[PDB]
Design an enzyme around this catalytic site. Structure first.
Site, PDB file in Angstrom:
ATOM      1  CB  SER A  58       2.945  -0.267  -0.673  1.00 50.79           C
ATOM      2  OG  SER A  58       4.212   0.452  -0.558  1.00 50.79           O
ATOM      3  CG  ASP A  78       8.972  -3.034  -5.706  1.00 47.45           C
ATOM      4  OD1 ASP A  78       9.504  -2.181  -5.050  1.00 47.45           O
ATOM      5  OD2 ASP A  78       7.831  -3.510  -5.423  1.00 47.45           O
ATOM      6  CG  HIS A  97       6.283  -0.400  -4.986  1.00 45.09           C
ATOM      7  ND1 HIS A  97       5.486   0.529  -4.314  1.00 45.09           N
ATOM      8  CD2 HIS A  97       6.582  -1.356  -4.091  1.00 45.09           C
ATOM      9  CE1 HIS A  97       5.341   0.137  -3.073  1.00 45.09           C
ATOM     10  NE2 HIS A  97       5.997  -0.982  -2.890  1.00 45.09           N
TER      11      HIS A  97
END
Lengths: 300, 300, 300, 299
Positions: free
Chosen positions: C152, C243, C273
């Protein structure tokens, strides 16, 4: 995802109805037809409406003609409802809307329904009714051309009958107007699996309607099985973004163009299965139906 | 179109070889096999290779076992080639790579090829050979568990034999490793229509391979026709982004999870059909094969 | 859609927390970090774990080194958390798992968090810590090579620091291992709009994080704005099917391969995610992380 | 699976290669002459009138087409990347919009890049809408006024509506958007998948973007806007095989999330420029007719 918020209610109405694969099919047809006639709008006014009896080999079908323009030309309309429900009465406001917006004759035909009548009955009803009217033009006051149209299961019939006309070298419809037809034996495309639950038409309802209409992969059941798309009539295809049936329809447009058939295909952004017959409920859907109906006369 | 540039030569080779549906079955097999033999890199060295004759009811298959690690467990591998081509020789470099990277025994099985042998000949070869080796596991020096794997047509056999084991409540493979199987009767998904020309496996060649294997929609030809995915072996599914066979494969892994079967699926970004056996020409592909091979032993 | 049902609990839990975009950042950090520590599972055993202070110019960072294998080589790991949350303790179960599965040293680095520390502080922390450890490698017992990795927001830092090494012609990391990085200024791609509210990483939160991190075009904030991807380190890119951040990531892999940088990209089918740090609740996610971790040592 | 009607245009565009080094005035000249050279027979229209719109600091040409002695109008901002296009090269197409819609079409010539950079064209669009909304009787307009465009002109139409809403000024009746550029995109899936081979390339997009910008402002890029509420009813047309498609389909979804009336259609097999290709693709022609035939309902 990003389904049009106009659909929020219907997507609720769908969910809270629960599972219906277990209630008698005749019982189910009745409920669904009664729902459809319920919160409906003023029918748009049509100059002349005329009821007909289409006397075919061994069966007679009801047909209602809608005419607002003393029209030369016509479209034969085959309603949707998964081959299980729909009828002239439930389609009446929609066929009116089509007639008003197109300014051509719209002839709404009641083919025979599953599971009482299995494939090829409704197919043979559509093909035989097209040829019945094509020979009996004057009875219907048709001085010009005749095309065919439908939504969902009825758009399957419209596409399929055109293949048969082409195969037999018979008289051809002038146009095929297809609002999201079933076309293929599909339980695996991406649109099918992504939108297989919660978007009104479910994966389970597709299989159930499929089981009711079929006995036990022919091109007149599933047009995407055809080996050849050349010399079919000019087509208008409408698909819905969030609809399990979307991907095979967009492939069909592409196959027609590859075969040199005149075809325009549009995907409605944020739309779901049943959009066109939702014209009184979704303004986006209403504009898509108005767009198609307004160009229909150019083909007739 | 952003296909990995390592594939560019292969795509060109493939376009410049002309229309392959044009040439007769046995001739095409030989040309495709010889094409892959040429592409060959230096074979990875393996500690033990052994040749076997798998003596089944009415035919005998060759099998070759690769073992770099005196392994307790094994994967039975069914090669791809559309049911028409491929053999132990053309798969030898790739099977050595699998054995080196996984550290388990890899047994590459030569099933019978179409059009000389149609469905269900290869299928019965896969299922019978799984059970033969399972029953005779000490002959292969197997003391642990046995899984099944394949690519393309061979991964169709792997997935289908697992369905038959489940249906019959027989011994089950420990894992099914599926590199881009054919699974469904598909001439209409989006991946099929979008990628059916410039990506080595064409839509036209898919149809040619299908008509050669089939006689004449049952689950052991097309696993996606199955009613029920429960109680199948844990699965590893590898799809390629730019491959007409991709969408049904992604559906398959979602239907396994929906049924509560352990499954992991990965789509290789920028990859095309055949990517795994193209491990010597694409480092992207080589790493995807390595990723999968290195997790195989955890299932065994 | 077809999100892997292993995530249904997390999706529900995310929904139950409501809209946290009007929460003050320090309170939100406390909520999310403490929530995570309260609910985590059993940690995997690692042979050696050691805490370090990375004494950079003007600030000292915490770092934890995990080494299950007395390894020669290392990955510097930069955790996720939107630039706002996460820390060594909340990542400790996950970093242990990467160490166990890769067999290499993993060094988890605590860069400075926003909004107390806005861009470019975390970025400079990532770039400066790489160069600090690379210069002082013998002090950390690193005899071999050093790569960089993250998830991320941390994978954004990993990708961005490589771009600055390339621009400055400095020592470059051996590999960049990118689990679903934020890379682009995106409120409009199709994955963004289709997947931005189903609760876990929403559109509103993506904006909230970006506004907290930015002070108000800089490729070191958004690598997709670089005009040249040449001469970057070999990459592993993992994206998740469902995502909002997915489409820019899959473009980044393709840009890397267009510039001739070694890169493998995989999309996890059914994943959301945060899938990698969800390795204790989804076996599919666990297997994707194992796949990656087990090929990392080949780059070092 | 691009509609085979575009085969030729795709080939011709591939042939031309990367024209970045051609002087922008020459690229404008060539693309404009290329449009004029390939014109079909113009559709006849009852009334066509030329106007000067005298704004602060500049005057714009405008051309009004009216086939139906109409009471209402659409102001049309042509496409061309902010760099090319003009009333002459758009004349066959604006004639067709006027024939099919039966309402007045007033095609406006805004100032072009790079000679005139953002916000010049944007100011031209917003100022000419307000000029004609204030001066409706001078154009024979008794009813309502909407705004429309394709590609860069559809950006101007979308962006001027945002400024009307932001200033709580008079609003257009409808915004009809043929595949606008809307966002700072070099990374969406449609962008990267359709970045070459589909007439409009990723390199052209960056090129036009660089010519327009003086080098994330919402009247440049409407998808940067805070809020989409209280905008005019919209018709959005996207093309399947066009790098600009995904942000446009996002915009229609955002309008509807905000409760703005909108209908969005993706043309199956279509490419960027499909509407101004109405003489060479029947599917494109039918899409433009669909849209033009619904326009009067908003006016």
């Amino acid at each position: 995802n990003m389904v049009d918020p106009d659909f929020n209610s219907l997507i609720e109405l769908s969910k809270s109805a629960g599972d219906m694969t277990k209630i008698e099919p005749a019982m189910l047809r009745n409920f669904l037809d009664e729902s459809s006639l319920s919160s409906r709008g003023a029918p748009v006014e049509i100059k002349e409406i005329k009821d007909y009896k289409i006397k075919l080999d061994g069966r007679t079908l009801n047909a209602r003609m809608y005419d607002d323009n003393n029209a030369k030309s016509a479209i034969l309309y085959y309603h949707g409802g998964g081959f299980l429900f729909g009828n002239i009465e439930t389609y009446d406001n929609y066929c009116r809307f089509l007639a008003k917006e197109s300014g051509v004759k719209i002839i709404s035909i009641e083919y025979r329904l599953a599971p009482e009548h299995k494939f090829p009955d409704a197919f043979n009803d559509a093909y035989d009714s097209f040829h019945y009217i094509a020979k009996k033009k004057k009875d219907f006051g048709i001085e010009g051309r005749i095309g065919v149209a439908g939504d969902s299961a009825g758009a399957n019939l419209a596409a399929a009958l055109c293949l048969k006309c082409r195969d037999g070298k018979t008289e051809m419809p002038a146009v095929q107007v297809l609002f999201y037809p079933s076309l293929a034996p599909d339980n695996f495309s991406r649109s099918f699996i992504e939108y297989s639950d919660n978007y009104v038409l479910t994966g389970k309802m597709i299989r159930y309607f499929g089981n009711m209409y079929s006995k036990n992969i022919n091109p007149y059941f599933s047009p995407l099985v055809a080996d050849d798309f050349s010399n079919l009539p000019p087509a208008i295809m409408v698909t819905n973004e969030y609809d399990p049936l979307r991907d095979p329809e967009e492939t069909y447009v592409k196959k027609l163009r590859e075969a040199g058939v005149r075809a325009v295909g549009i995907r409605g952004i944020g739309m779901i299965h049943g959009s066109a017959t939702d014209f009184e409920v979704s303004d986006g859907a209403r504009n898509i139906v108005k767009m198609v109906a307004r160009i229909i006369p150019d083909y007739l």
